[PDB]
């Protein structure tokens, strides 16, 4: 379903990419997107799918667009428009200078100091989940570890009941990888029906959980509103539930297939940090955009006020101009260039938590279960959207090759 080409678009710039169902999906998600970087594709293209929108295909353009909030506003950051429209998360649907005050608070909740404090639980929970898995010689990594690990830590941070997971998780998924089961607004509403009561309850009787800190926070010398708090917490949930979860499955899927990569990490543990970076570049998975605040001419292409443009954070690091042999995983690259956690003022606050969750998992999984692989005849399927994912990850191993700790 291609929408009719708007008048201002040179037909030579058309490239019908469907962000929700790329063509090469079988080959893998990062691979399906990278077709945008082939020689036959202009740097800046227009796609008639999902209502028509621009796509910047190169690291350089993406970084520029992200730096430029004057022209490229966060107001309507999701494609399609109804989604970017219904989207009112804070600080994500705001531009500087307004953005800054909400950012500062959100930072209080997810920042470094919080990670440092939660470190022992992270380490505790991972060791526990793995040890539990170890003797089975088989899981569903996606359901068995990728989901529980990050979510339980979040539920811990937020002081929310583990029981709300399934419900919460469904709504989150609807937003990033729309099912067709519910629209963005319907989905936004449900997450909101959820948060409302809790926030109220934490304004009256504050805790030490993330929600309490948000609900009772100060912004521009005055108290945050209830609606504002609802809107921050809404974002925290989606990052908490939907990002780390998917990243881990790509990395684990990759590790299950590359014995040599596993080994390197086992023998030269000092490399874990460099490898985490490489994996964040290679298995990057977020694609959001911006809205043109006016007519603007960008790299010789005429953009019209109101046009949306996708600036796929995923693409910067896969771009050959940025990284030689981009599709190749090399833990010892001189420079790992990516924008996996974004670029500009909206640079991801949860990056610290995310990095801690990844490193712990690698170090801990490798220690106990150094040798594993994908279940014979399982066919791994990726999914595309704002946040790309893995559907299921059937792994098998010989219990006799594991090590208890
Ligand atoms: C795999 C890990 C993650 C990746 C790849 C990721 C990616 C991103 C991206 C690309 C952005 C900027 C979007 C934009 O400019 O439109 C962002 C922003 C944000 N992320 Fe992360 N995210 C991850 C994990 C997390 C976690 C664990 C949290 C905290 C629970 C989180 C919280 C946030 C927040 C609060 C923002 C907004 C910052 C602002 O608007 O100034 N993210 N993330």
Swiss-Prot record:
Gene Ontology CC, one term: cytoplasm
Residues annotated as binding heme: 348
Catalysed reaction, written as an equation: 2 reduced [2Fe-2S]-[putidaredoxin] + (1R,4R)-camphor + O2 + 2 H(+) = (1R,4R,5R)-5-hydroxycamphor + 2 oxidized [2Fe-2S]-[putidaredoxin] + H2O
S-S pairs: none
Keyword Ribosomal protein: no
Entry keyword Disulfide bond: no
PANTHER family: P450, PUTATIVE (EUROFUNG)-RELATED
Function per UniProt: Involved in a camphor oxidation system.
Name assigned to this protein: Camphor 5-monooxygenase
Taxonomic lineage: Bacteria, Pseudomonadati, Pseudomonadota, Gammaproteobacteria, Pseudomonadales
Protein's gene: camC
């Amino acid at each position: 379903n291609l929408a009719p080409l708007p008048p201002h678009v040179p037909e030579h710039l058309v490239f019908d990419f469907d962000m929700y169902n790329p063509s090469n999906l079988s080959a893998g998600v990062q691979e399906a997107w990278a077709v945008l970087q082939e020689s036959n594709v202009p740097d800046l293209v227009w796609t008639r799918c999902n209502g028509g929108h621009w796509i910047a295909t190169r690291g350089q353009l993406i970084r520029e667009a992200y730096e430029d909030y004057r022209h490229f506003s966060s107001e309507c950051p999701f494609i399609p428009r109804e989604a970017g429209e219904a989207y009112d998360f804070i600080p994500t649907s705001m531009d500087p200078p307004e953005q800054r005050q909400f950012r500062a608070l959100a930072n209080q909740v997810v920042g470094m100091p919080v990670v440092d404090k939660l470190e022992n639980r992270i380490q505790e929970l991972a060791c526990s989940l793995i040890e539990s898995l170890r003797p089975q010689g088989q899981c569903n990594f996606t359901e068995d570890y990728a989901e529980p690990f990050p979510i339980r830590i979040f539920m811990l941070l937020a002081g929310l009941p583990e029981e709300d997971i399934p419900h919460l998780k469904y709504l989150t998924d609807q937003m990033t990888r729309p099912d067709g089961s519910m629209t963005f607004a319907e989905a936004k509403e449900a997450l909101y029906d959820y948060l409302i009561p809790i926030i109220e309850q934490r304004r009256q009787k504050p805790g030490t959980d993330a929600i309490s800190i948000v609900a009772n926070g100060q912004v521009n010398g005055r108290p945050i509103t209830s609606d504002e708090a609802k809107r921050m917490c809404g974002l925290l949930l989606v990052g908490g539930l939907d990002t780390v979860v998917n990243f881990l499955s790509f990395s684990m899927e990759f590790l299950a297939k590359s014995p040599e990569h596993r080994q390197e990490l086992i023998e030269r543990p000092e490399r874990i940090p460099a490898a985490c970076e490489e994996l964040l570049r290679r298995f990057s998975l977020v694609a959001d955009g911006r809205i043109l605040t006016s007519d603007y001419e960008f790299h010789g292409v005429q953009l019209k006020k109101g046009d949306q443009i996708l600036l796929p954070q995923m693409l910067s690091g896969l771009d050959e101009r940025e990284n030689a042999c981009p599709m190749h995983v090399d833990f010892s690259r001189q420079k790992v260039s990516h924008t996996t956690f974004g670029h500009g003022s909206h640079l991801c606050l949860g990056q610290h938590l995310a990095r801690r969750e990844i490193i712990v998992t690698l170090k801990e999984w490798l220690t106990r279960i150094p040798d594993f692989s994908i279940a014979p005849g399982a066919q791994i399927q990726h999914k595309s959207g704002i946040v790309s994912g893995v559907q299921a990850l059937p792994l098998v191993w010989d219990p006799a090759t594991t090590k208890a700790v």
